[PDB]
Design a protein around this ligand. Sequence first.
Ligand SMILES: [Ca+2]
Ligand SMILES: [Ca+2]
Ligand SMILES: [Ca+2]
Ligand SMILES: [Ca+2]
Lengths: 275, 275, 107, 107
Amino acid sequence: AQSVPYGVSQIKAPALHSQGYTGSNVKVAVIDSGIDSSHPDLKVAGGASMVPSETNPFQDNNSHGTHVAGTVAALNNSIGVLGVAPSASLYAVKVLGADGSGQYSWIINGIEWAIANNMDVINMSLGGPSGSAALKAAVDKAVASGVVVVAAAGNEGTSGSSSTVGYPGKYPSVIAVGAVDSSNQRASFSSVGPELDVMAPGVSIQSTLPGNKYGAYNGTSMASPHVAGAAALILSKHPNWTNTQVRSSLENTTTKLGDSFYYGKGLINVQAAAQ
Amino acid sequence: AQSVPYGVSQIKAPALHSQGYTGSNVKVAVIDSGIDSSHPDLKVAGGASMVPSETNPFQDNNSHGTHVAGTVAALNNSIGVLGVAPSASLYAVKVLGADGSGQYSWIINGIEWAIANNMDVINMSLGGPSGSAALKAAVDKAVASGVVVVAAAGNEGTSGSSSTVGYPGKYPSVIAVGAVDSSNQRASFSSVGPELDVMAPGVSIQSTLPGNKYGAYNGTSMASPHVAGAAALILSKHPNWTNTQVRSSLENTTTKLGDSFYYGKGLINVQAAAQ
Amino acid sequence: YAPSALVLTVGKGVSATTAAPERAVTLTCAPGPSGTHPAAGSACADLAAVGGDLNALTRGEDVMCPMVYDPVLLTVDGVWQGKRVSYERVFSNECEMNAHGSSVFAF
Amino acid sequence: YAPSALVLTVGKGVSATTAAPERAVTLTCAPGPSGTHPAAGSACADLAAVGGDLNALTRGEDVMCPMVYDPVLLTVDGVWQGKRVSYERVFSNECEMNAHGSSVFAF
Ligand SMILES: [Ca+2]
Ligand SMILES: [Ca+2]
Ligand SMILES: [Ca+2]
Ligand SMILES: [Ca+2]
């Protein structure tokens, strides 16, 4: 038996799946800790590693990237869970090590791999509080190249009335994603600031784990792949909409929630986005 | 210039000194950490050590015994301080080591030295919360032999309404001594219980330190030598009063203070004791 | 003579205990840097820097962590230059904890 | 695997700090007994006994101390069998402090 994580429902992915839009032929790079290609509920197309000491993109020693990958594209079958874009082609771009840590230049190189292999969507469930010119340049280049770039906003909760959005989420070219629970309430940990764009389910999100496992995680990390998977469905319905057009759609058809410093534009609704 | 510690005055020693009673020919054993015989304001007659690894009774590596010794008998001259019984013959019976610690059997052996060398007065500014049959036997033997035995009550303050008097102070044959300040107020640290006998000055008591020094200490330790010195003055006035008679005198002519659980019979007054 | 002795613990949770301590090390900077620190020499060095001041230990600048929320409690207890210390701080996840010192939490 | 790490300090006074820590050691019972303890092996043994319970460490019975009042503050911080510990106790003088453990305060 296959179960459908609440978060996939909340954003209205299943409405699109029934109309025959599953993310087919869309290339999504999950820039992360790798993806366990041996999981029964995943189908990984290719990828590469930028971690000098861990050169196999399909061996996830952290488990994070595998979870993220399943929220984007766990397969539509009769086992496990179900992803937002179950037919998307999934690429493992490994830039975080076993301990989850990654150098800035690894990240950048990951992004550069993604641009040159014609990825359609990038997901970066990673962050840091300092920005860098090369990092900025890399994200901007991706968006100039036609890639939809999605990132989680950060897990630093609120802090007075200053922005707690980290990088790369902070950069205008990036869709920065905060976490809501099943009740559309901002998770306490979700970063706030004028740079936050949209919200997605980020609280106890069921997904694939390495070793034919399944489990629930919390974080703006879990939120992000819901928007990335959402971009893949739209591209699968409208294959020559630009990244500007996909983004716009996602941002203008949200379900407004609280004030935009906490909730950005609100909860995405992919069925509404896809028109 | 010689100064007179307040505590020597409080008990009225100087009244006796002027009548010519200074403790002359009385043998006092200071059972302790040794006595620095090289101090200018002390005159040590003899003694012995029971500390196996520190065999010289006149080398005080702790400083405690030297202070105690000066409260009993710092010399009457024009330097330092002045003892209760400035002419007493002072014996160093060393039973505490450099760190102040001593085994029970060392203590006992000290007491046995004191009995066999015909000490008149014993001072034990030491204690422990457990008693022992050999310890009891030793103190009782001393009193059977005619020795006035004085000990400090302990520094465990109050504890509900249970006795906090330690050993040997707890044994009926021993005069157990608590500490008052210059205002006749019980020091906070002074042990309480039905076993406490008398009070003496025990708060910032000026006395000799090794290396031709002087300094002030706190404790029921500082109180005890005031009573021991007081026993020596009485013996010097009345050389064939028994130990029972000296004790009685000390106990019946006290200045009553608070309730006897805290203050025993009160503050000794040697001038009143000596009749 | 530096009275210098610290104990560091780490456990999953948001307060001292409601957070079982899963790992614990001891660090001694005085006289020489020793202890149970897969990085004694360095931590000491880090402290030397900021001069025992937890709260003045800059993050990374150069490192990214996954955006998972799995909090970690760090406690520090002891003395530095004979000044008592009892620090405690919750990090978002462990990667965040490690991007903090250089070496102190190099654990 | 025993999460075991303690820090012991001693200073003259009646409270944690209003009592400058003059001496400080670290003790590790797990895996093996180590640390900065002129008596590591033993302290561990003492703790083993009473099972990490400060407050159940019998005095002497066999030793006398001078009856000077010069208080000493002892603090213990860390974990024993992965259970947090923060003990603090004032003794009358140091001799009293040392007649307490066997070895723990064998410092
Ligand atoms: Ca499935
Ligand atoms: Ca943004
Ligand atoms: Ca003198
Ligand atoms: Ca008594």
